[PDB]
Amino acid sequence: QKFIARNRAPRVQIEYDVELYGAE
Amino acid sequence: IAEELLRAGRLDDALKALQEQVRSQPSNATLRIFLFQLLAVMGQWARAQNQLKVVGELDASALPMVQTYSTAIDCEALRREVFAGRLTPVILGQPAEWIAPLLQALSLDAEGHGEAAQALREQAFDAAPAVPGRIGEAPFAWLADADTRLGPVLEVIVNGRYAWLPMSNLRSLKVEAPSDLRDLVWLPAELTLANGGATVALLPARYAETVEHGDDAARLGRKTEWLDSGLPVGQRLFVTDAGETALFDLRELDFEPT
């Protein structure tokens, strides 16, 4: 069973608000 | 308006809107920074690279980003070839014998020998060591990528080159939430190797088939799912004996010394 995902149903995720204009 | 279209996951619409903004203000470096990142999310690699070049020429201070991410985009193309079995990735740190069957499985899949490929992956997985550790404070007995083509292997971009890093070669990993739009494609990471080395790295944050076969939500890393073909798309997911953690939510990962 090692290293095996037991479930392959879709996963809903946390969404992140990300910056669009920065380069540093 | 393009910002809000992005937030709604409407990539095509966001791109159309943003291109019109750039056309209107073609010397505005910040719009081209947005555009390069958006093109990267959409997997339009050559066009993203084109915008980086122009960003470099407009804003010389952005040049280290330009160097870093133009070579990251080059690496994203090696990924397609690697998972298609057409390109061999280099391996960082101590060689791991069990990587060889993993790599051979990729080339056997590509030739339509899926049974033989599965047999090699089973052997690779058997041979790869279960190493205990912690995600933050939560212990695990073993950890791997949910992608069975990788198992306990981390894809990395280090000093401008794509590589596989066996997780058994890893001591610790530290990452923060994604901060910039490009972070949805490549999540910055600090790696500490079992051999003592430490390096900054970029982690390809989505499964390689996401650009071609996912939807906009998968390209934005807002879901993880498996296609009828059995291949995963969307945000990278790690699984353990005890639970699972998506890459964007990972902060500290530590492995116990062997």
Residue numbers in the entry:
A (entry chain B): 8 to 31
B (entry chain A): 30 to 287
Please, what does the article write about this entry?
The type VI secretion system (T6SS) is a bacterial nanomachine for the transport of effector molecules into prokaryotic and eukaryotic cells. The AAA+ ATPase ClpV disassembles the contracted sheath, which resets the systems for reassembly of an extended sheath that is ready to fire again. The interaction of TagJ/HsiE with the sheath as well as with ClpV suggests an alternative mode of disassembly in which HsiE recruits the ATPase to the sheath.
We crystallized HsiE1 in complex with a peptide corresponding to the first 20 residues of HsiB1 (1MGSTTSSQKFIARNRAPRVQ20) or an HsiB1 degradation product, which appeared during purification of the E1-B1 complex. Both the E1-B1 peptide and E1-B1 fragment structures were solved by molecular replacement. In the E1-B1 complex structures, there is clear electron density for residues 8–20 of the extraneously added B1 peptide and for residues 8–30 of the co-purified B1 fragment, respectively. Both structures are nearly identical to the structure of HsiE1 alone, with an r.m.s. deviation of 0.4 Å in either case, and to each other with an r.m.s. deviation of 0.3 Å. The B1 residue Phe10 nestles in that pocket, which is lined with residues Phe154, Trp171, and Pro181. Another key residue for the interaction is Arg18 of B1, which forms two salt bridges with the carboxyl group of Glu273 in HsiE1 (top right inset). In addition, most of the E1-B1 binding interface is hydrophobic in nature, involving Ala12, Gln20, Tyr23, Val25, and Leu27 from B1.
